[model samples]
Target: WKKQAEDIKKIFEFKETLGTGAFSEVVLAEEKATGKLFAVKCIPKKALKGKESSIENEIAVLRKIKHENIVALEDIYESPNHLYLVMQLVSGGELFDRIVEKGFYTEKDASTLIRQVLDAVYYLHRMGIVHRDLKPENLLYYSQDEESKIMISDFGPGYVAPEVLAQKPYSKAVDCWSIGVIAYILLCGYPPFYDENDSKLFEQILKAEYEFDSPYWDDISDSAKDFIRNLMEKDPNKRYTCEQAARHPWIAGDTALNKNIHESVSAQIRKNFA
Candidate 1:
């Protein structure tokens, strides 16, 4: 870990810790010469001894993908004790926190965010990569004039083509499942499945059974529900493909344009909660 830290310090000066997790730590840093900002993710090599292939797969896949909505991986370095991945910095933080604070989003706001996310997922699939972890925590926003720009981060659990059983050779359809979850949460303010048991959560996910109630059910569009249904189908073959999802009625429908329609819904959300 010390050698890895030194190697990174040589290329970029570590500024401050951005976030930390059980397996890794993310730090805000700047290029020593250029002064460009970047996020450096450090993962202990010992923590990933048996699972080193996952890191290699993520780096290999990320290197091949290029999209504005996907966080760009700048460089990768390794030492005996740790591995480092330098990536683009996003300042707005997690999308999940935004949703929680705002409560719910208008269909237009939801569509705008979902469209960009789908575009990123579509781009990845075109590059033959599958981002298995596509939850809101992995979706980041930038605090710029363009608040709509999102950066999909955390490629650690991602998989590539030719399929590997260990990581589960999932295709781009997994992203659609994630999108469905996001859409559901944006509309209902909660996930479709809730359980304390990991095994039961997996079972419910496999069955794709979820309940809708009262005001939330009344407010959601049939098109939105149908969209989630297609995306979250248990059978990957029947699930919505990135291309198909892009063209879905809920996404490509009249909601795509007419900002007024979105504004009206946004007003309703504010009024209803207030």
Candidate 2:
């Protein structure tokens, strides 16, 4: 019954289109009253005709969460023509690209990143939000600053869990499984499972087939692998929860090594992951 935001231009001045998709485009907006910047995603109602529930679900979920390590949805505005989602503007690049460009990186560095993600995920899980999708693509830096923390973004599936591939009902454990895959990639620069064939890829995923093969994992600590193993367990019921993962030796303890892994990891990422 409240009336406001009907006039978008009266509130935020549209700066420029940040990016565009099939049905929507994100614009950089400046609040006229406060001069604050935000990423405003504009979705035309015409395109949203058949997908109302999906957008509603996304908005509902975004409205419930706020964390340092997760990008925030600030406000929502609707007009006769479109829906505007005002979101936190994260200017930093994706996590994988940032790591690839880094001069030095270590197991400890990866641990710190994962710890931030676990904290965010734990927060979401406690709120009954299952971020079923979590992968390198979803992990973004909050800013371009050297110390910028990773923020979870849109989400992906290379890090999908076994239960999801097996066509079974899944839950928050899927996110932990994804974190393990991401952790494995962060350490070695390549995924645990790979195949040109989608059928074979799904096959590998269903069986929890993967490895820490060769010299890539040789320098990685047992503690790091143990943390991953617990998360990547085939059975979702047995997999480590976010709270449990955050407390693992490799995550909270000193087992993560400081050895610079950039050379090897970056090379692999450039060749295989990108």
Lowest lDDT sum, 10 consecutive residues, model 1, at 157-166
Give the alpha carbon lDDT tens digit for every residue of 1-274 in model 1.
1224456677788879987889899899888979899998988888888878876775766665568898788777776677888888887766755544553446666777888889988887776667776776778887533355777876651111112212455667777777877776656555677577867765666567676566555656677778777876666788788789889877888643322233333443455342
Model 2 C-alpha RMSD to native: 3.1
**lDDT for each of the candidates?**
0.69, 0.85
Point out where model 2 deviates above 4 Å. 1-3, 6-25, 30-35, 44-65, 155-157
lDDT of 2 by residue, 1-274 (tens): 1124667898899988976789888899999999999988887889878887776776777676678897787888877777888888888998888998899999999999999999988987886778886877767898899989999764314678889888899999999998898899899999898898999998888889888898899989999989999998999889999999998989988999999999999999999943
RMSD of each: 5.9, 3.1
Please list all clashing residue pairs in model 1, or write none if there are none.
none
Q: After superposition, how far is residue 132 of candidate 1 from its true place, in Å?
A: 1.3
Clashes of each: 0, 0
Output the TM-score of candidate 1: 0.74
TM-score of the candidate numbered 2? 0.86
